[PDB]
Symmetry: C2
Subunit: 532 residues, 2 copies
Amino acid sequence: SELLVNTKSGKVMGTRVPVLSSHISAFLGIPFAEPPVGNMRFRRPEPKKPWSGVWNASTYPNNCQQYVDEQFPGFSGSEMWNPNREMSEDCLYLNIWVPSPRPKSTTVMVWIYGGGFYSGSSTLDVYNGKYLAYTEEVVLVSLSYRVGAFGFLALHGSQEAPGNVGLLDQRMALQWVHDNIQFFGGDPKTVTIFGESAGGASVGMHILSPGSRDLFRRAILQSGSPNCPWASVSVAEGRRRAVELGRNLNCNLNSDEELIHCLREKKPQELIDVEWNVLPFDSIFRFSFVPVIDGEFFPTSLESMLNSGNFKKTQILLGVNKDEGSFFLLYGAPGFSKDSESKISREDFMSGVKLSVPHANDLGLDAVTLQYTDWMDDNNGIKNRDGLDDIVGDHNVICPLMHFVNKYTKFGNGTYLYFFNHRASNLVWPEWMGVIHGYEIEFVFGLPLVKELNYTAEEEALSRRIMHYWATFAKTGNPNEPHSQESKWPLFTTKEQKFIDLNTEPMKVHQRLRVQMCVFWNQFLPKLLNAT
Amino acid sequence: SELLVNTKSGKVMGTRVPVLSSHISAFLGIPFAEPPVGNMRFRRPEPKKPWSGVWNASTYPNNCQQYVDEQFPGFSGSEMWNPNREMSEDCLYLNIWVPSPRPKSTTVMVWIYGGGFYSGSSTLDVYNGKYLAYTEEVVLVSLSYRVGAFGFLALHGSQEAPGNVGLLDQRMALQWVHDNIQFFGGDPKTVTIFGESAGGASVGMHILSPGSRDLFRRAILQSGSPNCPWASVSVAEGRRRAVELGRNLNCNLNSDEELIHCLREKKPQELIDVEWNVLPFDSIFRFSFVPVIDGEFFPTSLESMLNSGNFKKTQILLGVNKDEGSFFLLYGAPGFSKDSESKISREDFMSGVKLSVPHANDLGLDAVTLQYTDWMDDNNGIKNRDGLDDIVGDHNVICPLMHFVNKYTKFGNGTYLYFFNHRASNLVWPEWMGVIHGYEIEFVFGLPLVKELNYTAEEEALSRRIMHYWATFAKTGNPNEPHSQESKWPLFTTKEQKFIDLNTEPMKVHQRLRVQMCVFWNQFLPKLLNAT
């Protein structure tokens, strides 16, 4: 039977699903690691012991234990991201979408969801790989990993909570796709991993980490990269937050065993209730428990790794959204409202800069404000709002990614950069937000193709274009069709630095994506803060 | 006789001169102080003892002993500034241009020439007050003062070379215009002093100095102000350069008397031959001997004086030229040539920034370069040239003047700002220089009116407009005609900050003259250098 597959871990019974008035196979909820519950909390994942009989993989699995957003109850805008399944500490499962008929050895794509390393589920509606699998004819895999404290608590030096266990989770899933995707019709020697936000950062982290390099062929990073100021911390800070977390739940802090044991006896929702209290600064776009440069998963510092060419040299396709920042200002910077034009005053603009660059001294706060203020119109509410919006995006997503792409391209075998600047027609968020963080995803998974979702004809045209770029890239290492008559997406090169816009308009190539600011954030500000 | 005048210092015989096919009186070379020669060198000026008989004042006087430019022998472009008379240590004389018939009590205008405090003469062709005196019907006075070491050597604490004796010279001349201009038809209670470059800085200095305030009514400052980074030094630096100067001429440096005496025995051209060796840094737009904040001429620091409102509150009319910098890059920054488009490379651009901001550490040099580089076109020869050109002007003339005007206007009784952005049609310097430093002067003195000088009809129209603004301002404290139908030159106010362009086009009012950069140079860079 087409729905029965025999993996090295046991047999699995998938289910047939409808898509665009046709059908494909779907094996949902396949396990890849032993349940990380009980004494296994904070501990590295262990391979799932084989099983007898047929594993029923026809329904989604549970979602990892996480923080849930309730800033806008009912609002589909924010809930389409909350977990749609029962949260449980038993979350390590993966989902496979296979074409019909089953391929012999087709291309594989592994999606690592994002969420600031503190949330995220594979089961979300927006991450439904059937449209993509079907339209491009590729095996679509969707893995999950532990987030928040459960996956990133780090007491370096111990084996009870080494840290990065959440990244190991992802690696585990990739190991399984490597040892078994062949039985689903996929070619293990051609797996493309791709992610968004924290997922884009994770993808970049497997490219740097020696122990993950051999497990994939290409990569696609979206709106995120390993060297983002929010994507990692030092063992020292990781330790500081580990303790503080414990201090909030009143735990014995005499030794790590002392602490770790107390944390394992707590209910999942208790660590989550105090999780946000451990941040060092009043900030925006910063998360509690994240990956830590431990010396294991990451040999040395990330910067020196990028400078020494110590990383998987392959091809990569990456890009950013026009308005990455807006989403965080809404939730945290004073002055922004989901229901107003949110024009920001001088007072609020500056409180904004203080919240955005939390580690900068007073001299730096001035350097940032000077670089982002049109003194010929300093009290223009719309200008201060878009400027604040820009600071958040440039510092957190756009300028850190350009540093990566430029360092990478110097040792890589092909780079393709994009700039998604199209706001969907059916967005429910205000206009002042614009091309919001994460909304390029719906085009990658092709939700525009399903009529009932209400997308313009040109938008659906854009979705197919993008799916064909991603899919063609995953297969060939080049987003372009061999002998096509369509516009060629130029290659990014240290010299030229070309890139393209991605919207419903005639492809336009450009150069040096936001260099003016990328120099301020990657060269000057770092230097300024060091000398002062 | 109309040409014979009886001053309180003695009688003087002037001469009748032709102007625009008519005639006016001219009393050239009237003395106002005792010859500062011999043991009087470096010493404060002393009032000129009265004289019997008639002083012959029909020919120009001598020019102060100064450094002469020979970077372009023959070139009228640079020689129209060199001294046109016999240089002599006996230089303190003033020139008066009186209308005909002699007025009873008309308006007076005293011009203080510029020259970086190291050169300058009243006798230059460009400073011929007959055209102005005649066209506007005002008594035009032109004084002179000692420059270079001869007028600014400063060994604070001694009476042999207190410092600022050059500014005292100017004050002396103003005292004489105050005690005698009435006998030439001028009204002593309505004297406007106006200057250019170092003259604009001197004008501003009499506004701050308690001992000069009572000697004039209004002021006009052009392309220069008291708080310019080149217009003054501390007693400490003044002392350091005094000694070094002595060290270059091999003088006994055991005591001030030791030093001062050795310097008085040297020929004038010997101090001048080594004058430039005493600068602390390799620089551009910096001069050896200049005014020093001594605690006498200037009660306290200039910044605190401007902040406390400690200065003559009156009306002032000031402005800058579009391209103040170019003149100094030509002579000192590597890459510029009087005979080429002078496109500048990255290497030379940066050597440029190092020469322009001599006191900045490596962090500041980066801050300046980042603020002035279009990273989307960093190797554009014309862009780096105009950027370097801009840095020199903004830092030295334009941004320091805007700091003054903004601090002044807060306690003044009327401010009028202009922006001269018209390049004369008959200029002999290359185009890349543009609206060059000091060339707005020819319009103030009306050289466009004399046909044979080859100026366009519209240029002459501009000269008359400007002469009428300056003259009307000198008389009324407002550049505008009471009930005129012409375009009104708006008043500068802390709130609006309006200003006008001054060229052959329909008057256009603007706001916040170069605020983007004026904030970098007046607020951020100062602060940056302090913390680092």
